[PDB]
Every structure is written in structure tokens, then in C-alpha cells.
Amino acid sequence: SNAGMTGFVINTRRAPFDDWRLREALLLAFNFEFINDTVTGGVMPRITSYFSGTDLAYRPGTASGREAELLAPFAADLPPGTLEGYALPQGDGTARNRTNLRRAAQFLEQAGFRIEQGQLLGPDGAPLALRFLLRQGDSDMQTVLEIYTRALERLGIAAQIEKVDNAQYTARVAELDFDLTPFRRDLSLSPGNEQRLYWGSHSAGQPGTRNLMGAASPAIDAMIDRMLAATTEDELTAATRALDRVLTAGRYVIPIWR
């Protein structure tokens, strides 16, 4: 049951959300530990990867052994930090979260965003528009995003919650018409062909897709192929963990609790 991702999915098809450095900044600005203290009393652990809390979760630190061999052909093209050992940002245990917000500002600056009159301009010179597409009745997510919005304001990003009715929510998600939206994907301990529908390149562009993030990478596609093809336990575990590692480093979802 532990496998699965819950959080805010980022539409990587929509510039400038296609830039991993913007996604990294968005992840650093999300103060999970403070939000979790506030909304949950701090009792619910963060989801740390797609297969976290299972044997299929990647092992923290540098990719080694068979996992590293499976990933090595894609090394030049993997999300930065994939092989080095990527982990989600951890806040400082306060509301202000100073260090991570500074790092997030630095990633924005590196990616060509500039602050002009307290507004963060994208590389194209226009203010970054960030709307959270939210179902009307989703009060727990509304509370989360209200907190998060205030953090993003400190980066010069005037993020907006766009609350819509269920019919609109269904339409907008089906048409991939959003920046960020709440997301849940339930995952099996025996993942199979459906993984192509969730994260595979061919599903990225397609109306109605489960691949809301628009993940499209040869490395993801290859790890799914390797998982499905595996004839040993060692190989199946290695391929599944490699998939978990690449999906997590893709910075597609801002994870919360389950």
C-alpha cells in the first residue's frame, strides 16, 4: 500500500515548468515540515519517492551496482543529481525556512528569472504565472496551498489558487490545462504494463493521460522495459529502484503525506 505518490504535480509541458531548475526552486520553497506540523500535527511522514516505504524504493546515495549499470547509458541525459543521490528538500523546522528559500532564489536566478519591482519575471521577460488548479471542496489542499503561496511570494511569485467545480476540474485535467494541481497515483507492489501509461513518453502528450506531469525520458522508458523484461529478483528490484530514482529526480511532483 505504501507505494504511490501524493502531492502537487507540475505540468512540465508548459514553459517555464519544463525547466528542472524552476521545479527545484518550487520544491525548495515547499516547507513540508512546517506545513505538516500545521495541517497534520507533524504525525504523517512525507512520501519520499514513488515507491517509498517499500522494497522497491531506491536506496539513498550514489547509484551503485546493477542499478548504476542500468542507468549509466543515460548518464548525460538524466535529471541533474540522479546518479549522485537526490533527496527531497528538508525545511529548517521554522516557518521562515530561510536557507531553502535562498537556495530556491538562486535556482531561479540561474534559470534566468529576474526580479523587477517585486515581481519574478520568467526568462521571456513576462511575470511567472503560477495557478494551483484546485477542486472546490478540497479544503485540506486549500490550507496547504495557502501556506505555500506565502512562501512563493517571498521569491517574487504571486501564486494564485484557482478553485473550480468538479465538472471544470475534470475538463481541465483531461485537457492538461493547468500549471500545478493536486495529484494521487496509487501504485502496486507488482508494477506492470500500466507504468507506461503513468510515466511513459508516449502517454505524455495525450488528452486524458494519467501522465499529468508530462514525463518523457528515454531513461524512464528503458527502466520500465527492463522491469517488464527482468527474469531475476535482483534484476527486477534493480530496474524498479532505478525507475523510482529517475522519476523522483525528475522533480515532477511536490510530495506531501499519503
UniProtKB/TrEMBL annotation:
Localization annotation: Periplasm
Assigned protein family: Belongs to the bacterial solute-binding protein 5 family.
Name this protein carries in UniProt: ABC transporter, periplasmic substrate-binding protein
Naturally occurring in which organism (per UniProt): Ruegeria pomeroyi (strain ATCC 700808 / DSM 15171 / DSS-3)
Lineage, highest ranks first: Bacteria, Pseudomonadati, Pseudomonadota, Alphaproteobacteria, Rhodobacterales
Residues of the full protein shown: 314 to 568 of 604
